[PDB]
Write a protein that binds this ligand. Sequence first.
Ligand SMILES: [Zn+2]
Lengths: 49, 410, 303
Amino acid sequence: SLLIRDLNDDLSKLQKDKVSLEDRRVIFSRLMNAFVTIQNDVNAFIDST
Amino acid sequence: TFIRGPICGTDNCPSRLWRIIDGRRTCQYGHVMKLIGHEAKLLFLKSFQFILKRQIRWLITEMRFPKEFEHVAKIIWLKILKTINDQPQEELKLQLHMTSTISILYLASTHLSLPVYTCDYIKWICTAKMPYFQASEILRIQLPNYYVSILEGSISPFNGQLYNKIALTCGMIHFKEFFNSEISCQGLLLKLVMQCALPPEFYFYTKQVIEFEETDIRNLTLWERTDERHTGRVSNHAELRVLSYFMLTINWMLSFDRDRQYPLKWILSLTESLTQRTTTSESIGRNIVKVVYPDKPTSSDYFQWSEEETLEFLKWMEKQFLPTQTDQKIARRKLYKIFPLDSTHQLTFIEDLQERYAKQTPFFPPARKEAIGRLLTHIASQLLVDFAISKEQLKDCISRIKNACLHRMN
Amino acid sequence: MFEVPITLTNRKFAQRRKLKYQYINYISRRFDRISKQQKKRRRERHWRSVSFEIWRTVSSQNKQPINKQKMTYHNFKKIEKIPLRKMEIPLLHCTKENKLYFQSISRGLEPLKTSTSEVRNYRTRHIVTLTDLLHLNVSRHNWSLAYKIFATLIRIPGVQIKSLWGIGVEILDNLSNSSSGLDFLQWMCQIYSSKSRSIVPPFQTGSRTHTAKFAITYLWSSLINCQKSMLIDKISEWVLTPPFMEDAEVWFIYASCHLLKADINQVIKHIHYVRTFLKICLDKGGFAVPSRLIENQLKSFES
Ligand SMILES: [Zn+2]
């Protein structure tokens, strides 16, 4: 949760009105990672299955 | 059945909870749910006198003194005790500094004509053997901090404070009729020749210059109670004059051997056998005194010491600085217990003495004055640390008494 | 002729500090006028700043634009004339030597004799020689002797020593016996991180804001005790343990633990991990490789 609140903090410190596109791919990469692992931890509890 | 805790949940106790296994918890009625002021003169003189007899215990025991000393001490400490309790004021005006302890010890020893001299005391106390540098050392009594300061203060003997305090006591109660204040002169001469490596002729040389200026009459008082003094009285502590005659003798004697009895070389070899730092009980001691001597160079002298000197030093530190002064505690017993607390090599005194006497045993032109001078200055150094005085003090004395020999010679 | 590891013998040095900072107050007070109690001493001494891996300084840019002479003879003696008499009052209470010191430092002369050089006690002088022989032997690789010195020393009641870097590098190069440099350091942090001045520059410090030298050096040096390996999750487990948030250097230690553990999706999580802590290490006063270099190692990993 804290870690995503940080990804979200750096994400806003785009314009990228300037700002070179590709970081778009890496930010997404980090976001997918976060969603997947939180979703896993929830699953595991409801659920270790 | 006790646990004290949880008072009692009944506001007509609270009386005192024990839990039974069945969990009722049951309460008894039967619910089931500094220092002294202004006359610590007496305590002061008791820690002082106690510390004195403690030191006497160490010197009859560990120094093989005679038991008579103790009585001589009760007499002198008795005389000055009677003199400070012939004094009125609630304002204390006493100075029982440690110099007074050593002062009455030397006073008594000198009445008894024992061949102990001030330098014996300085060595004894600076090497933590004779307990000194504390009030009632770490282990006693809590006194008014005014008197703990009257003890811890003035502790040093090292500028002639000892000679001045023994003369001061020698006024406080009179030396002349009551005691015999002649110093043990000739043993000091022996101590001195052996302390150098001088051949035994210099004992009789200096003994003779001694007889020449004095005819051998040596006192203890320098007293006219004051601070004030400015001529005649740098040089009337007998010892200091003895050392002065000793130095002079060497200088005169060696610089006027028109015979040429004492080689231009053997003065050098003498200087070098004197200079070679070697590890005997004595020199190790003189290093220990060098550490608490006030003036440089002697501390640069500790600089020029060697790993074994430093080692035996830390040894003497863990031995004689257990005579120190003044939850987390067990945390520091385990904390320190984290790292472990844990054919005889070096030689005796007359061994070293013998071997430098041999190191010169090859016995059988204006720059030999140099050899005379460097020998005199090294000898001086040893005397300065050993007899706890100043460079300037010594040379004041031997200057004055040297003019005191030229005057009665010209 | 070397620094002593003891609290300095007291009275006269403290009352001299009084005279000094009190006169300092009167002169600087009247100076700001012309530009327009232990506690008095406390506020007084208070309002004043109290190709290789160079922890660089703060260089020259964004700073003032000069001053032109403030102080002629007449104007200075204007500022000086009055606070010197105010000083004439408590000078009458201090000792004659102390008064002389006040006179000379206030003329601007600097005293011949050190605090040590005029100091005057058996036990402490002996501890001085003990500690000295410790430091000397540790310099001399004499880890055996030095160890004896250390044990005999810590035995003593007398003084606590900040001297701690001395013992950190001491037990470090000692290797001999005693619960070692790490144990000492984590002890320092455990005892001195809770409410539970003269002596203190930065190389020995308190745990409100950065205790620096010893902490960062056991940190890095422990990561080098992993250079022994190829222990890490231990070192960053107890770099994880403490809260003393003004570090970031332990953020780069952390991210270095993740780069060392990254040397399969587990290794992925370690690489995303170091990617995170390098920015939460941009949190604070920056430790920077070009860091696109850090990332370039991370792409050699992405292989
Ligand atoms: Zn009850």
